[model samples]
Target: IVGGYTCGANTVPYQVSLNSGYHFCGGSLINSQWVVSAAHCYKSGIQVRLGEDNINVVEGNEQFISASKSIVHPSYNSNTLNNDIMLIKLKSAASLNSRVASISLPTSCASAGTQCLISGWGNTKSSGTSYPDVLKCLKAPILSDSSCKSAYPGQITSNMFCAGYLEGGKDSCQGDSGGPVVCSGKLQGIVSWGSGCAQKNKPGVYTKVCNYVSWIKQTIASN
Candidate 1:
C-alpha cells in the first residue's frame, strides 16, 4: 500500500539484455510513465525484455522492449554503489492489456517488521549460484531500523530498509538486486544489499523507496 493505502497497480518485471552469462535481477513497470531498475542491469546490456518471463527476448515467447535511453541515478557512485538505481526509457509504453503492471511507490513507508513479497530469479542457499528462470518468490518481513544498524555497524543507513530471515538462507541473493520489495501492495523498496544472501541476524537490505519519493517523482516528471 502507498502510505498504508493501496494503489492497486499491477506490474511485470523485465530482464535486461546482456551477455549470455549475466543474470538480471532488476525490473520495473510500464506505468509511472517509465521503468526503474538497477544500474548494474544496464551496465552493458545487449538487449532487454518485458511482458514475459523468458529473459531471451528475441527467441522467447514475450517480446522485448528496446531501450531508447538509459539514465542512472546521478548520485550513484561506483565504489560504494550507494545509489545503484536507474531508469530505462522505452521507445514506447508496453501494451496495458497485459496482467503486468507497475508497482506503486510508497507515499509513506511502514514502521518495520511489515511483511512484504519479493519475486525474482535468485539462489536459495547463501552465496549459491543464481537460480534458474523459475523466478523464485519469497515473503520477507520488514525489519526495524535500529536492528539493521546493529546488524552491520556503519553499513545500514536510514535510506535503506531490511527484510529476511535471521538464519542462514533465503534472501534477495546475488541475482535479485533492483527487484521490487512490495509491502501492502505498494512498491515499498528495491533490493539493495544483504549479508551473504541470508545469514543469521542478517536481513536483506533494500533501498528505502519512501526516503527517495521526491527524487523519484522529479525523475519521472522530467519524462
Candidate 2:
C-alpha cells in the first residue's frame, strides 16, 4: 500500500495472500479453515498462502492451501461494491504456529476517530501496477459515516465505511483489496474499494465487518 512501511514478518500472522495462480489480493485468516476477503477477488484457480510476509519467495513459515469453495455474499453488489466480503473454505485446516494464527472478528462497530491499521501488498502508489514483495502497513483514522457520505454521496452505504488520510497519502491500493482493516486488535473492516490511492479528500473505503458478523457465522455454519 502507498505510504506504508514494511511490516514485521510476525506482526500480522493472520494476514494471508489470496492467489489465483499469482498473489493478487489479501485476506485474513479467521478460522482453521476459513479466510475472509473481498468477493471481487473471487475467481477461478484460487488458492491461499498463510504465514507469508514476502510474496515473491518461499518462506519456511508459508503454508499454501487449495481453496475447496469460495462463498460470496448472496446480495453482494459488484456494481456498488457493497457487501464486498467473501469467504474461502480451505481444503485443509491451517496449522497455527508462531508465524501463523487467526484474527478475531470485531464484537462492535468502530466509531469515528478510532485509529486502525491496514496491511497489504498492493501498489505503492496510485495507478501503479507493481506491488511489494514484502507486506506493508499503514495507520489511518476512521472517518465518520457522515464525512464519508459527503465524500462519495449516495454511494457510501451502511455496508461500507471509510478510513485513511483526508490530506492524501497513506492508503491501501489496487492489489490491497480484500485485505484487513484492524481496530482495537479486531478485524473491523475489509479493504473493499477507493476512488484512488492516497488521493486528497478521498480516503480508502472498506466493508464494515461488524455488520456482516451474523452473516459470516451463518455462512460458515451452513457451509
Candidate 3:
C-alpha cells in the first residue's frame, strides 16, 4: 500500500489481475483451472488475466480467461469481514509457462517472524486512491498470534492473520484485495481487509489459507 516498489515481469508467476472490465483486485492462481481471491472481489463480468506485469501493455504470453463460476464461502460474514475468501473456476485452464504457474498452498501455519511477500497492482499510497500500471511488491513479516490479537483486539479471529509493519511504512491497500501473502514459497494468506492502509499497529489482515484447505479441496472438487 505504501513504500512498495514495482516487481519485475513474471517474478510472481502465480499472481493474477482480477478485473470487472477494469483492474480492481489481485488473485493467486491455485491451479490450471482455479483461482483463489477475496469473496468481496466478486462482481459481475469478472475476467482473469495471467502471465503479465503491466496491465496496459499486451504480452504475447498473457492469457485472458473468463470465469465459469465464482463461489463465495457460505459462512462469509460481510459485516464482520470474516471468511472473506472465494474461488473462481475458469472457463478454460491457463496454459503454464515460465511466466505463468500455480502457487502451492501452505502445509501448515506460517511461523511468526517469517518474511512474507505481498504483490498487487494497487495504489502506491493509501490516500492516492489510484492503482499503478505495473505490479507492486511489499515485504511484510508475519505478526505473532498474540501481537496480532493485541493489535486488532477482539477483531482478529482464528481464520484471519496479520502481516505488515507496525511502524506504518508498507502494506497492501485498495485494489489489493484477494492478493496472495506468500511465505516460504507457499500461499499462506489472502489479502482480505484492514482498518487503514499502513497505519500504525493496524497491520493488514488476511484470510489464513491453511485453515481453509479442506474447504478449498471440497469446493474445487464439487464444482
Candidate 4:
C-alpha cells in the first residue's frame, strides 16, 4: 500500500496472502474454510497463508493451506473489471487462534466519506517493483459515486467503488488486489483496480462487498 504504515504483529488477523511460490495477492479470511479475494487473482494451485504479518520471514503463526476450489462471480466481466470478486474454499478449515481469525461481512454499504482501513503486502511505491516484506495499512475514505464516475469516466459501476485521496498519495497498489477494505469492523470492499497507485484523481477502486453478501453466503452454503 502506498503512503501507509507497517501493521503491527497480529493486528490484522483476518488478512491472508494468496501465494504461488510467493505472495502474489492479499485476501481476507471470511471463515475457517472460505476466503474473499479478487477474481483477477484466481488461478489453480493457489496456496493461502494465514496469520502472516511478514512474508519474507518464517513467522511461526503462519498456516499455509492449499485452495480446494475457487469460484469467481458468474457475471464477472474481465474487460470492464466489474464484479471483480471471488471466493476460495480451503482444502481444510483454518484453525482460529490469536494470530488467525475471520472477519465479519458487512451488513450494509459504507457511505461516501466513510473512513476504511486497507491492509496489504502490495507495492509500497506507485512506480517500480517494491513489494513490502511486512503488511502495510492506510486509512482511506470512500468517494461518492458521482465523484468516482467523474474520475474514471464510464468505468465506475454499481459493483465497484473508489476510495482514497483525490489529491493522491495513499492507495492499494500492485499485489494488493484481493485484499480487504474494512469499514466499521466489517469487510466493506475488496481491492480491485485503479488507474495507478496513489495517483491524483485516480483513487484506488474496490469491489463493493455489500452488493455481494448474498452471493457470498449462497456460494459457500451450496458448495
**Cα error of candidate 3 at position 57, Å:** 1.7
**What are the per-residue Cα lDDT tens digits for candidate 2 across 1-223?**
9988999886899899998777899999999999999999989778899988878888679899999999988899999998899999999999988788988998899999999989998899765566788989999989998989999999998989999988887888988889999999999989999887899989999999999899999999998
TM-score of each model, in listed order: 0.82, 0.97, 0.97, 0.98
Q: How far is candidate 3 from the true structure (C-alpha RMSD, Å)?
A: 1.0
By TM-score, is 3 or 4 better?
A: 4
What's model 1's TM-score? 0.82
- Give all candidates' CA lDDT scores: 0.62, 0.90, 0.90, 0.93
> By TM-score, who's the top model here?
4
Candidate order, TM-score descending: 4, 2, 3, 1
Report the poorest 10 consecutive residues by lDDT, candidate 3: 122-131
Considering summed lDDT, which 10 consecutive residues are worst modelled in model 4? Answer: 125-134
Q: Which ten-residue region of model 1 has the weakest summed lDDT?
A: 1-10
lDDT of 1 by residue, 140-190 (tens): 788787787889778766667778777646667766777777788777777
